Ligand binder design. Sequence first.
Ligand SMILES: NC(=O)C1=CN([C@@H]2O[C@H](COP(=O)(O)OP(=O)(O)OC[C@H]3O[C@@H](n4cnc5c(N)ncnc54)[C@H](OP(=O)(O)O)[C@@H]3O)[C@@H](O)[C@H]2O)C=CC1
Ligand SMILES: COC1=C(OC)C(=O)C(CC=C(C)C)=C(C)C1=O
Ligand code: SF4
Ligand code: SF4
Ligand SMILES: [Zn+2]
Lengths: 340, 198, 156, 174, 83, 43, 316, 386
Amino acid sequence: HAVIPHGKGGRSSVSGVVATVFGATGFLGRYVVNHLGRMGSQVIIPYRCDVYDIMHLRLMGDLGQLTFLEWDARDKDSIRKAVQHSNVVINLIGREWETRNFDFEDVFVNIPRAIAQASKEAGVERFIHVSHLNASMKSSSKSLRSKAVGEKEVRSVFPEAIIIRPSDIFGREDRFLNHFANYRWFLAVPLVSLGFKTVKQPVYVADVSKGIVNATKDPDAVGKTFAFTGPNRYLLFHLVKYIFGMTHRTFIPYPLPLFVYSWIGKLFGLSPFEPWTTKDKVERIHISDVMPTDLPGLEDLGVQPTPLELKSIEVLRRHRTYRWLSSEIEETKPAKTVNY
Amino acid sequence: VRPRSDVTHKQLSAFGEYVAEILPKYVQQVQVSCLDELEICIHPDGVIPTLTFLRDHTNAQFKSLADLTAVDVPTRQNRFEIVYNLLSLRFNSRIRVKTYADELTPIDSIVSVHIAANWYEREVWDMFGVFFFNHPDLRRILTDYGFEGHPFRKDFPLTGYVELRYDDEVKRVVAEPVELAQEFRKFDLNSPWEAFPA
Amino acid sequence: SRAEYVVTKLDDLINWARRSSLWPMTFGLACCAVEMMHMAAPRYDMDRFGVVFRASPRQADVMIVAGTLTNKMAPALRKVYDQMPEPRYVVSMGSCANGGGYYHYSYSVVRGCDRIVPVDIYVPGCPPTAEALLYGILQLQRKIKREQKLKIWYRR
Amino acid sequence: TYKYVNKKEVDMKSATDNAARILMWTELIRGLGMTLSYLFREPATINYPFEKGPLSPRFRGEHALRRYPSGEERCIACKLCEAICPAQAITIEAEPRADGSRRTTRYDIDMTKCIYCGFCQEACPVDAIVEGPNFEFSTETHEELLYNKEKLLNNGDKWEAEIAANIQADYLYR
Amino acid sequence: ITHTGQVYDEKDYRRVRFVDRQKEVNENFAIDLIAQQPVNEVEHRIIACDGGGGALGHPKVYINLDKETKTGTCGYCGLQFKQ
Amino acid sequence: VKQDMPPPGGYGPIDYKRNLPRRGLSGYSMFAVGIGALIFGYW
Amino acid sequence: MFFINILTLLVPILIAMAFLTLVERKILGYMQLRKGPNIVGPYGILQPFADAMKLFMKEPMRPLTSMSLFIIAPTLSLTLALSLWVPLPMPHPLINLNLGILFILATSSLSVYSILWSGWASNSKYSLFGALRAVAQTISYEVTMAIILLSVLLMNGSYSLQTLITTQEHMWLLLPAWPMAMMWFISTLAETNRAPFDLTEGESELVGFNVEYAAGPFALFFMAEYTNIILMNALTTIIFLGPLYYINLPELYSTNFMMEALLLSSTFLWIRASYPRFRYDQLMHLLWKNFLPLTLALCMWHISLPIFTAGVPPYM
Amino acid sequence: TNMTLNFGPQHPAAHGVLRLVLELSGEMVRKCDPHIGLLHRGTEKLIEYKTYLQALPYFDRLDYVSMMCNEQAYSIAVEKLLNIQPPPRAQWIRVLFGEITRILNHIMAVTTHALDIGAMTPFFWMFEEREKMFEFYERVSGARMHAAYIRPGGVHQDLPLGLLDDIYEFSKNFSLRIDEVEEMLTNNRIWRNRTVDIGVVTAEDALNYGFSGVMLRGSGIQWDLRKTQPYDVYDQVEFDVPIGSRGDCYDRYLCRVEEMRQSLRIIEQCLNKMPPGEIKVDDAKVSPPKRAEMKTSMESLIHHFKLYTEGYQVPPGATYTAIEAPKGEFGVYLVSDGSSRPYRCKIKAPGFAHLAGLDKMSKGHMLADVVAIIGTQDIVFGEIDR
Ligand SMILES: NC(=O)C1=CN([C@@H]2O[C@H](COP(=O)(O)OP(=O)(O)OC[C@H]3O[C@@H](n4cnc5c(N)ncnc54)[C@H](OP(=O)(O)O)[C@@H]3O)[C@@H](O)[C@H]2O)C=CC1
Ligand SMILES: COC1=C(OC)C(=O)C(CC=C(C)C)=C(C)C1=O
Ligand code: SF4
Ligand code: SF4
Ligand SMILES: [Zn+2]
């Protein structure tokens, strides 16, 4: 079972990767389908969002490259038919807010298991499972711990299943960068420990995507637990200010106990419509980025990471004002890099 | 059979000599075709002079420029064949003055003689690449702002080399080398049997 | 009382409002525009169905791309598609915009508008008949009727 | 023969006449009368789903492949329908069917490429490919518009009765 | 499945398409329909075959039903004629 | 076999000229009725 | 009670405001040989409610612009227009104001800002050019609009709109003062930016403040314009066409007010379909050259008619 | 940049797609530089790769308001190169549908002009009449617009049995419909203002910038290629060119309303005097054989097969043939090698010249004036962009 790769390399060409991608509608997802579609791969995108929302993905895929299937996580049968004819399964199912009808376990461990489980029954050559970086089975945030729980299980349902483990991602439409920039509405921008001792290493979304895609088309990655990290680390302080810097909005980093702040996250979490902050998110935000001692991701998988400052201008531009909208990054001052 | 009126064939032929004598210097060949039309062929240097005589001569007033075009015969050393078709509202008639221009040997501009040519000359530069000296503002008219290559040249691929699609990653329209999903089927149509010229 | 029921009914209302009043922003690139002006005209009144004669790029619910989307006009189409509201739709009209049409192999014509704007209903025909556009606008109305945005919210 | 569209004393009667035209907007009132008049005329619109705008037999509409009454598809893959298509829409590849006869393995009309010229209707010797009456085939997805032999043959079977009536009415003319 | 039995296969990377949407295939396949057609008996050595209806048929051809050994088959209708 | 042709004797005649009617109350008469209205109103 | 009397006088007008768009999209239709909207609901009655719901649901995109001079502008437009119905004297008014017409003139004048604020807020060229021209003709027309009223008042005796019901107990103020009615009607057409004078929404010209306004903001001005369309027509139906008033039965006043207002509201609908739009300078050429000299002179005639005809109106 | 402001491609005011980069000191236009090619599609290069009969459908699309009149120009051109001329009935047909098409264009130009000006009821009034005309096209060709009826050797198929009668009923009444528009716009106290004395073009300047259309006729120059150089049987009819004086937007308009009137005079005649006969040349060499003949005669099949698959095989030569399309002089310069597919086919578009004049017409004019002048040139971007 395979498809000899013919063509010159662009759209309307063939690469031979038929791939179910269950959580494509996501920020990371959007990018994964982009490269897969650019390369000419056959992409099956399972969806449970309404057809109007899935429209953005149609255009990057060539005619007949993208197939959309109706799928429900609780219904095992839907996952069954999606992987019927795929040979690569990529799992990006994740959320930050435990929803009424889906718990962190479900979105991270429960569902992503059933999926790979079926994929095996199907006989998919490889499964790529994505879990957050620094995910201990004991990490504070229920999210991270639960994700850790999953990366274990799925091994047993699907052995030698690649497990890329990305850091918080930097990209347009990302949270890491937009969240902080959107603190503008808040007059003061709380920062636990005044934004210190939680060094963070962002990674451009594309780098992550390209990396993921390259995995699909490389035999070197099997059972590998890569870690796409980034080109430079940062104390949360510079990051926050830098953001506000490009956004050209004032910065008032205010110390507030994580204790009390976990409570603020609880407050937003209470909100019915997509809580903006999450008790877990808060914790995750402060969880310091771990140093790198694992299977190299970017570069190792073939893409050289892209510095944050380089593309930050595009992600944070929408947050500027009438005039600030015309400033460029090089007249602006890039913040210092703290490896710690 | 078309209703040819020899009355015309003669009168236009006679004018063709008239012009040939009046401007011995630039007219190389003058011929009245069977359709019954007339075409005075001029050296490229005679662009300004031959037109002006036709625009402003009592016995040949050719006030409006119907068209300025450039066939491209790749075999011909001078690739382009700029053809100017002109109309006489008074004496009622039309004459075509055609010159030859190579790719990097520019022709003079007649925007002075007829301002109609301001646009057509820009059209000839954009499609074929001939350049017109003394043109007020020569710049691509029909092709895209960043287009590279002159399209109507016989040596330019129909589909071209670039096509546009919207890319989400970059959230902006982006050229890519053309990749066609059904190439233009190039039917060979010429028959190996000719028709004995009448 | 089951909210699920309460939700469906509500959604329907929402769908009825958008589907009854679709204010089309038409481009009229090319000629298929003449066949749409005919729809707006008296034999086949678009307004009767709630489609307004025309509106600006903002107040417009649906964009009808009529005519060849040439490479120079391709950046614009997008701009205007990107300048419309959150509930927006695109009805490609004409073989020249469904695919490439008579000018598919040309160097200046985008082979389809669905390469520049996501397209919801493709209306076929070189001058797609005005009745056919009307059929296409009516099928967009059935597409909207089926959309169930709040029930997915509730079940999400 | 020519005509002057707009080629052109002062008397109280005249002036008073002209001044009244400017002062009491007499001609403007004339225009209002015309629109009030139509308000009273019957509207020309048709209930689109219930009543349909009339199309006579030559209407080109949507492509279909016909079959002989016996049940043998008419096309014999001469492939000049492909030759004369202006848009390169029809793609035909053929091979001798086991019967020994000549039939098309693949006949694909790309309707998005097609500009509905109706020459294919013209060119076919057996008149296998016809411009069918239906104009309402708008489709949600681009792929549906591409049509293979099975869709066109199915289109042919569905509309054969009207296609036969339409060809019956117009063949003397052709 | 179809006329020339198109069978995107259990391992093809294209059979993915029909998922949740049916395939276009034909009942009353033509391959068997003329085979179902009776052999038009004739008296004359040669016979015509307008296809039935003249202008609304096929370019008229004359078939040589001269050998009972073979029932002439007009290359256009696939109709066998029994001398 | 029949060919659509003009009916025998030709068709009837069509109008190719504007038939716009120059109909209006004369200006003096128009002003007088108006001025009379104001005079009555003022009184 | 007074609260109930605020629902009535508001809702009723809002519901009627919705039915004007419908009677606009059908009367324009039949004039142009087309049925107009009849398929949604019965005879299109549900049509106005339908797009209202579509408009509010669609995203109110805030341009990459002010965020207040943007949201203040539609609020001001709806607030002033619905407010000006407060003192209108149908039968007897809700809030009778001794200087009532000055209230109506002042409240109208304030709406010109909404146009100015929306145009500055959009921060795109089409909006600013449209707003500057729009503000220009609105206040230009205000100058003749005000003088035309001052001529009226001097023959009414007071600024209170309630007095005209007693002034017009024997004859409409059209008979006298018809020359100004016409000039009040044309000025009412300019101030509601309706057709003959509608270069603001001129589409071919500046596709204009409403350009960046979509969904809820679009609607509020929108609602405002149409309510105004009625209010100004209603002011014509009190000041110049005086509906018969019988003290014993107050509703025949409102019944005829209903009839005259609808017909004059129908008239600007009929004007729109019938006439091409005037040029920007052609519009101001009319007011400053054609109308202002007529109005100022007829203004003096209305200070003289009272005195030498010994008809000085009774104050109060 | 004197507040340079792109008129913008998406604008109801701009027919189709026109970026008019205009620098305006407040509401006055200092300079108009129209941009073109927003609808270039390659029509001239594509034709070189297609046979003569499969390039006929391109001409309908070049300026599709005037669907057929354009087809006649290519027809004539291909007929000249072959020295073949169409049969008598076909000629009258082409003049019959040639004129019907002129009306269709003028109803488009006059009513669309008003919609940009702001008058919207004339468009709905006359689009109903248009509709009725389309139906003629459909019942003759099969397509409402983009017919492909006028082919290089005559028309494709005789008129249906009954069309002439209906092209009468309509013609018998259309006049009143033009009359109505009139009572609405010709003398409107306001149409005149926005149109009168706007875009005046001198006579000498109009010839110089190659205007060649109503635009010339409106300035008082008397030139109708249909009377000066008769094509088809426009010689046997009798019509009056509507010349104009004080050329300006209003005068030319009046001219377009007058040719709508004169075309009804030409249509009447064509119905009164159309000859019995064939509608396509009898040379199977140029015109495809009748289907009864190709299905019973060998020489006819061979001629059907070769004509559809390969082509006319026009003799080598070049011609510029111009007709009087509704917009103005539409001409095809068709250079041709002996091959069945053309070598060059520059389409002269009445419109490439007219737009150029926008600059010399709209000087010291307001934004609204520019909208009025684009209307008085009947710019269909298909012909300009080709
Ligand atoms: N920066 C980041 O976002 C990082 C992400 N990751 C991991 O990478 C993955 C992708 O991230 P990202 O795309 O941002 O995540 P998103 O929040 O964008 O969600 C990803 C997709 O999962 C789908 N989904 C969510 N919940 C469910 C459910 N209960 N059933 C079915 N589908 C569901 C969503 O579809 P819909 O919304 O239509 O339901 C969405 O398209 C995540 O799983 C995350 O754990 C790791 C590190 C950093
Ligand atoms: C005459 O040319 C014109 C077009 O070309 C066919 C249009 O598409 C359009 C756009 C059509 C609509 C219905 C907005 C206009 C306005 C126009 O004037
Ligand atoms: S599709 Fe046919 S009709 Fe529509 S634009 Fe392209 S060519 Fe003109
Ligand atoms: S022409 Fe008619 S028969 Fe010959 S191939 Fe095309 S369709 Fe089949
Ligand atoms: Zn046979």
